[PDB]
Structure 1
Amino acid sequence: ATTGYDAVDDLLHYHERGNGIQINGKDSFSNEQAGLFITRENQTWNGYKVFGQPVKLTFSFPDYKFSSTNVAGDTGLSKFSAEQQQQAKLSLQSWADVANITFTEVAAGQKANITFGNYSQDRPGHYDYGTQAYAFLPNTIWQGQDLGGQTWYNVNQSNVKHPATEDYGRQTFTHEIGHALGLSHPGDYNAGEGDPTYNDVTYAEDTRQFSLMSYWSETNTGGDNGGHYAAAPLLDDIAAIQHLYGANLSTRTGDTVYGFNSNTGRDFLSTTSNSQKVIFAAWDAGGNDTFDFSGYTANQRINLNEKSFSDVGGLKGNVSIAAGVTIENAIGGSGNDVIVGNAANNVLKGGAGNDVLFGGGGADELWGGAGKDIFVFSAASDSAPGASDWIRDFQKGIDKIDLSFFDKEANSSSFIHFVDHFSGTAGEALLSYNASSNVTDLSVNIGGHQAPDFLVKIVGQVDVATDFIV
């Protein structure tokens, strides 16, 4: 039994977590739990244990003196270059997009909440090629001085010097800012302190697939970013930062397009070519939105449910949707895709290739596009009379309608069965073809009611002998 439903079922159970689950011999935490563990120090710019309140912060790029020594003892200091400043500002904005944080730049001489500076020596006249960067959480006091907000980077590392071309560099900026806002790593470990490895994590999801605060490879949980690094807060980072400063309800409230043809104005949410891969966790506060992954040629798996992961552009588990966000439409690429909608009305387009489309609840509009496509249904409510799904480009003898879930569940080959007239018997399915309108009605009486409780409208003719999977 290799059906469209199996592919759907697989994607729906991808990366399940929490509720007493255990992965890699470790406890699994839900998105909510992870967000809380990541902010376990309880420090915020609004005060200790003061959660959910908005904050206004200033930042700057001070003019550090080479010969000066910073609080951690590093020296060979320097001001961020123009390329570093530009990428740092993109990293700041990516945090402000998801939580109620306002960032305002002040002059180098003015006191600032968050600062950025380069270092190159661990002792005078001795270059350091072994460290990467560090930062102090809010309310870190030493000798009556508040160190919170300072972020320091080893400019001897090429990724730090050229964050615009080395994605690890941009990720490092986002990570350090995360610390400066109050987030810790998801587990108790820190560079220059023992020999930690993924085996030392507290919860399974402590990887770069779920949080950029993590040190561990996404491959530990089955992800694969193809050698790239996420530039902006990931799924669990969003939960963490929103716990501290609240969710930003004014972000992208209009109709937004993510991926190709994007109108987000965010480098990490957009792409203009098959070679440019995206890695992101989507936060969107309103509107009719679309995941457009039409320009990719790889086989993709797109799930529009909240907190779920998708396989986009040749990568694995690189795209996700934050808790409480509703993304309405999705467009597949020229590969053989699996596209799973949600309870809202979705517009799903498979594009070329042999796709599997699952609308779920609501009134969906499904387009298989070219290729041999399969439209899957598993509940009467997937296409209730009054709110029917529409299959707009069905090709008889080529595409298929998969109703296999039903007989499997009933464990009976005769539950779903075609008839020429209803009788009130549950399981009866009826096809009504209108040659003048080019529309075929597929009615099914799943519950055994007086009237059918499932009705799909199909543009095109359907051949009962070859077009169904039952």
Structure 2
Amino acid sequence: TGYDAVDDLLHYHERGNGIQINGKDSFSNEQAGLFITRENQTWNGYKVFGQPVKLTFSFPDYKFSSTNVAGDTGLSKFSAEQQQQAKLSLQSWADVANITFTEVAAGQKANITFGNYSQDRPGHYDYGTQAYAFLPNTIWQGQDLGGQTWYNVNQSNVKHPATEDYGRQTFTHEIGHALGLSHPGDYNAGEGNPTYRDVTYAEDTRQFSLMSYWSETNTGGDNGGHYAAAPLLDDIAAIQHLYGANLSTRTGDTVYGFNSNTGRDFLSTTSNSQKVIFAAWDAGGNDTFDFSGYTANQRINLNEKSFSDVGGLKGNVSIAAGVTIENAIGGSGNDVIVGNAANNVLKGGAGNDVLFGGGGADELWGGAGKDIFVFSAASDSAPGASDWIRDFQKGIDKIDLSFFNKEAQSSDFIHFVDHFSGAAGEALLSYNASNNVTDLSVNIGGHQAPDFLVKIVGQVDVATDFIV
């Protein structure tokens, strides 16, 4: 049924509680955020949480034969492509928390620096390391190391971060450390041969945080060989904990995915081939998840902290805590689109879709194909704030009310009548041929008047259009 698909999506990646996943404890978004910031180091001071911060960053002009604090040498300044990408990564962090970054001169003192290294000792190239950074307040010999970030330029991803997504992800990850974030676990277990097996909580994967080193597949995600460029779900909780949430970000009407007005490479796509991976942070306005350009079967969940399967990937799109996304457009595959308590505009597109409005006055468009519109509560479409099904096709589309008889464990709870009598479960269809509108009224609660009313554009055939 339509309802089963909805139910499945709503319980996708449940966490916290007393859940155990890979035999490991499950942490909520909030718990994971606190754990990632367990060192309690911030640019505002030790254990100084929630205050905005102003930071400067630069690309020092390092000497090849110079040695850095960690002992690496064969140093060099970030190239133009590296600089470009590092700036995009900084911005991705500035979008979600109250952090202001200002670029200063190669010469001057900066809070955050970027540099490349290539040798672990003079005249000896290192092909085994990737990058490292120091957390704020890292004091060495009366010198603060905090803010320094270094990368192995012998690695092609580091050298060409504009074409190698692991490279862009690395930049974002190192900057994360430079801001006060740690890996989601110490994995101090056994020795120095860490595995996902070594994590503290199940959500320590690249599905939830780019601070993690473990594959998103460990938790059931699949990024299709790609790497997220910007902070993920748990990364946002962590950084907002440190510097507060950025309430100024994308406060107007924003479109994510296709026909994007975000101005963010990681929040936009121009073709079926360009896959999106992101955790959405948005502070206000009427927004839309536009995934109309994808051909795969997608599952879109507009609730806060939930995961979506988009563009052929699995659990690659999520919504941060405290964000309300209002509209969703599916593609040409067979989709499942679940809304939230606000008014939503849900469009299935071609394919056989399942649409669920949830609370509020929603506008549902099945598009082409055989669509199913599901309801599970009288409050889903209360008289006064009714949902509208704008393109119902009789003998083709369906209205799924299966939840009610299922719950009542009775085949006769929901039953169609010619006139209301005040009995609970009574359902009535009123068709207006002059205006092409059918009213579906149901007395779920059993009151003097129906507590559920859906307005449908088109004719509905009671003999074939319902799932009860």
Question: 2-side partners of 1:192 and 1:216: how far apart?
Answer: 17
1:446 aligns with 2:421: no
Distance in 1 of aligned mates of 2:111 and 2:134: 11
> 1:269-307 deviations in whole A, cap 9, x for unaligned?
000000000000000000000000000000000000000
Q: What do residues 404-461 of structure 1 show as CA deviations (whole Å, max 9, x unaligned)?
A: 0000000000000000000000000000000000000000000000000000000000
Q: 2:352 aligns with which of 351, 354, 369?
A: 354
CA deviation string 1:216-246 (max 9, x = no partner): 0000000000000000000000000000000
When the two structures are superposed, what TM-score results if normalisation uses the length of structure 1? 0.99
Q: Deviations over 1:368-402 (max 9, x none)?
A: 00000000000000000000000000000000000
Q: Deviations over 1:11-54 (max 9, x none)?
A: 00000000111000000000000000000000000000000000
C-alpha contact (below 8 Å) 2:86/2:171 kept by paired residues? yes
Match of 1:385 in 2: 383
- Structure 2 counterpart SS, 1:59: strand
Deviations 1:188-237 (A, max 9, x none): 04899710000000000000000000000000000000000000000000
Give the 3 Å change call, closer, same or farther, for CA 127–193 of structure 1 in structure 2. farther
Native 8 Å contact 2:85 2:162 kept in 1: yes
For structure 1, the residue ranges without an aligned partner over 5 or more in a row are none
2:383 counterpart SS class: coil
Distance in 2 (CA, whole Å) between partners of 1:190 and 1:97 is 33
Give 3-state SS (helix, strand or coil) of 2:358's partner: coil
Match of 2:116 among 115, 118, 125: 118
- The answer to whether the 8 Å contact 2:303/2:339 transfers is yes
Change (3 A) 1:128 1:190: farther
Greater shift in the superposed pair: 188-197 or 6-15: 188-197
Mapped to 2, the partners of 1:190 and 1:229 lie a distance apart of 26
Tell me, in whole angstroms, the C-alpha distance in 2 between the residues paired with 1:44 and 1:366. 46
SS of the aligned residue for 1:441 comes to strand
Distance 2:262 2:188 in 1: 35
**What is the distance in 2 between the residues matched to 1:370 and 1:160?**
45
Question: 1:155 Cα shift?
Answer: 0.0
- Encode CA deviations 1:57-112: one digit per residue, 9 max, x unaligned: 00000000000000000000000000000000000000000000000000000000
Unaligned runs of 5+ in 2: none
Corresponding residue for residue 156 of structure 2: 158
In structure 2, relative to structure 1, the CA distance for the partners of 1:227 and 1:335 (3 Å cut) is same
Pairing 1:2-401 to 2, within 5 Å after superposition: 3-189=1-187, 194-401=192-399
Secondary structure class of the residue paired with 2:240: helix
Aligned-residue RMSD, C-alpha: 1.0
Cα distance in 2 between the residues matched to 1:355 and 1:135: 47
8 Å contact kept, 2:394–2:459: yes
Compare 184-193 and 456-465 and name the one that shifted more.
184-193
- Equivalent-residue separation in structure 2 for 1:193 and 1:394 (angstroms): 62
Whether the 8 Å CA contact 2:189–2:198 is kept in 1: the answer is no
Is residue 304–residue 319 contact of structure 2 (8 Å, CA) maintained in 1? yes
| Paired residue secondary structure (2:88) | helix
Sort the Cα spacing of 1:191 and 1:153 in 2 relative to 1 into closer, same or farther, 3 A: farther
CA distance, structure 2, for counterparts of residue 49 and residue 364 of structure 1: 44
The alpha carbon displacement at 1:333 in A equals 0.2
Alignment length (residue pairs): 468
The answer to whether the 8 A contact 2:183-2:211 is kept is yes
Rounded Cα–Cα distance in structure 2 between residues aligned with 1:32 and 1:293: 28
2-side partners of 1:434 and 1:19: how far apart? 49
Q: 2: CA distance between counterparts of 1:190 and 1:227?
A: 28
**Separation in 1 of the partners of 2:356 and 2:454?**
13
| Contact 2:72-2:121 within 8 A present in 1 as well | yes
CA contact (8 A) 2:98 2:245 kept: yes
SS of structure 1 residue aligned to 2:81: helix
> What SS does the corresponding residue of 2:463 show, helix, strand or coil?
coil
SS in 2 for 1:261: coil
CA–CA distance in 2 between the matches of 1:232 and 1:384? 40
Q: Does 1:425 align with 2:423?
A: yes
Residues 304 and 322, structure 2, Cα contact 8 Å, conserved in 1: yes
CA distance in 2, matches of 1:189, 1:135: 18
In structure 2, do the counterparts of structure 1 residues 186 and 94 end up closer, same or farther at CA, with 3 Å as the change threshold?
A: same
Counterparts of 1:160 and 1:56, CA distance in 2:
27
User: What is the aligned-residue identity percentage?
Assistant: 99
